[PDB]
Amino acid sequence: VPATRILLLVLAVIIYGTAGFHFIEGESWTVSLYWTFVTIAAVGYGDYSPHTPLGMYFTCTLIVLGIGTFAVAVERLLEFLI
Amino acid sequence: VPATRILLLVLAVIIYGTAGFHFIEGESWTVSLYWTFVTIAAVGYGDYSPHTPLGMYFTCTLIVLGIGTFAVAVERLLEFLI
Amino acid sequence: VPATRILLLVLAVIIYGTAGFHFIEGESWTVSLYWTFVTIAAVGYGDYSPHTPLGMYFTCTLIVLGIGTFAVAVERLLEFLI
Amino acid sequence: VPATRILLLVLAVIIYGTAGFHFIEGESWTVSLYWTFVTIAAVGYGDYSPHTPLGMYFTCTLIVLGIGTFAVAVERLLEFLI
Ligand SMILES: [K+]
Ligand SMILES: [K+]
Ligand SMILES: [K+]
Ligand SMILES: [K+]
Ligand SMILES: [K+]
Structure with missing residues (x-):
C-alpha cells in the first residue's frame, strides 16, 4: 500500500x-488529540x-x-526516515 | 489461517x-468487556x-x-479494510 | 529458534x-509476578x-x-495453539 | 540497516x-529517562x-x-542476545 494512502x-x-473523545467524554480538543x-x-x-x-x-x-492502522503507519514512516 | 477462524x-x-473479569473482580459486564x-x-x-x-x-x-490473538486479528482485519 | 528454548x-x-521488583520495590511475590x-x-x-x-x-x-522476548514467545505459542 | 546504526x-x-520531558514537564533527569x-x-x-x-x-x-525506532532496536538486540 502506498505510503501516502497509509x-x-x-x-x-x-x-x-x-472528535469522538471530545464530544462523548467532553475533554478539550487538545486533550482529545493527545488521548487519541x-x-x-x-x-x-x-x-x-x-x-x-x-x-x-x-x-x-x-x-x-x-492500533493496526497506526502500527502500519509508523513502520512506513521508519523507511522514509531511515 | 482463514480470517474467519481468527x-x-x-x-x-x-x-x-x-466473563472472567466480571465474576472474579465484580465489575459490570460493560466495564469488563471494555477492560478486556x-x-x-x-x-x-x-x-x-x-x-x-x-x-x-x-x-x-x-x-x-x-495479546497474540488480538494482534493477528487486527492485521487480518486491516486487509479486509484496506 | 526452537520453541522450547524461547x-x-x-x-x-x-x-x-x-525477583527484582520484589526485592527492589518490596511488593509481594504474587504482585511482583503480575507486574512483570x-x-x-x-x-x-x-x-x-x-x-x-x-x-x-x-x-x-x-x-x-x-518486551522483545515476550513478543517472540507469544507468537510461537500461537503456532502450538493454532 | 546495520545494528549499530539502529x-x-x-x-x-x-x-x-x-531532555524534552525534563525541560517541558520539569521532572528530574532520572524520572525523565525512565518515562522515556x-x-x-x-x-x-x-x-x-x-x-x-x-x-x-x-x-x-x-x-x-x-515507538517504531524502539521496536526495531529491540528485535535487532534479540539477534545479538539469541
Ligand atoms: K496506565
Ligand atoms: K498502559
Ligand atoms: K503496547
Ligand atoms: K500499554
Ligand atoms: K505493543
Missing part, C-alpha cells in the same frame, strides 16, 4: 478518535480515559480500527 | 476475558485492573492468550 | 523481573510501578530485555 | 525524549505523563518517532 488512513483515524495518539499507539497512560458507557464502546472501536 | 478465536478470547479490549490490545489504561490474587493470575493468562 | 528464555525473564507480566507484555496498568531510582533503572532493563 | 538512532530518541523508556516501549504506566499543552504535543512526537 498516511491518509491514519489521519482519518486520528480525526475519528479526537496515546490510545492508538497503545501507550495508554490512563491520565485520560472514557467514563461513560458510550465512551467505552467508542474506545473499543478506536482500538480495533486505530 | 475472528472466532478472538471472539472466544473476548468472552473468556469479559484495553488489556488484549495492550493499551492498559489502568482505570480498571484486578485487585485480588485470583484476578491477577487470571489477567496473566488473558495477557498470554489474548 | 520458552526457557521468557521464563528466565519472568524470574528476573519478579503486565510490564513485559507492555500492558502497563500502572497500578504497580517503581518508586525508587534503582527500581526505575531496573524496570528499564526489564523493558529492554523482556 | 542503536545510535534509538539512543538519539532516548536523548530527545529525556516507558513511553517508547509503549508500556505507559501513567505514573508520569505530560500535564501541559506543550508536553502533550511533545509526547505525541516522541510516540511517533520513538
Whole structure:
C-alpha cells in the first residue's frame, strides 16, 4: 500500500478518535488529540480515559480500527526516515 | 489461517476475558468487556485492573492468550479494510 | 529458534523481573509476578510501578530485555495453539 | 540497516525524549529517562505523563518517532542476545 494512502488512513483515524473523545467524554480538543495518539499507539497512560458507557464502546472501536492502522503507519514512516 | 477462524478465536478470547473479569473482580459486564479490549490490545489504561490474587493470575493468562490473538486479528482485519 | 528454548528464555525473564521488583520495590511475590507480566507484555496498568531510582533503572532493563522476548514467545505459542 | 546504526538512532530518541520531558514537564533527569523508556516501549504506566499543552504535543512526537525506532532496536538486540 502506498505510503501516502497509509498516511491518509491514519489521519482519518486520528480525526475519528479526537472528535469522538471530545464530544462523548467532553475533554478539550487538545486533550482529545493527545488521548487519541496515546490510545492508538497503545501507550495508554490512563491520565485520560472514557467514563461513560458510550465512551467505552467508542474506545473499543478506536482500538480495533486505530492500533493496526497506526502500527502500519509508523513502520512506513521508519523507511522514509531511515 | 482463514480470517474467519481468527475472528472466532478472538471472539472466544473476548468472552473468556469479559466473563472472567466480571465474576472474579465484580465489575459490570460493560466495564469488563471494555477492560478486556484495553488489556488484549495492550493499551492498559489502568482505570480498571484486578485487585485480588485470583484476578491477577487470571489477567496473566488473558495477557498470554489474548495479546497474540488480538494482534493477528487486527492485521487480518486491516486487509479486509484496506 | 526452537520453541522450547524461547520458552526457557521468557521464563528466565519472568524470574528476573519478579525477583527484582520484589526485592527492589518490596511488593509481594504474587504482585511482583503480575507486574512483570503486565510490564513485559507492555500492558502497563500502572497500578504497580517503581518508586525508587534503582527500581526505575531496573524496570528499564526489564523493558529492554523482556518486551522483545515476550513478543517472540507469544507468537510461537500461537503456532502450538493454532 | 546495520545494528549499530539502529542503536545510535534509538539512543538519539532516548536523548530527545529525556531532555524534552525534563525541560517541558520539569521532572528530574532520572524520572525523565525512565518515562522515556516507558513511553517508547509503549508500556505507559501513567505514573508520569505530560500535564501541559506543550508536553502533550511533545509526547505525541516522541510516540511517533520513538515507538517504531524502539521496536526495531529491540528485535535487532534479540539477534545479538539469541
Ligand atoms: K503496547
Ligand atoms: K505493543
Ligand atoms: K498502559
Ligand atoms: K500499554
Ligand atoms: K496506565
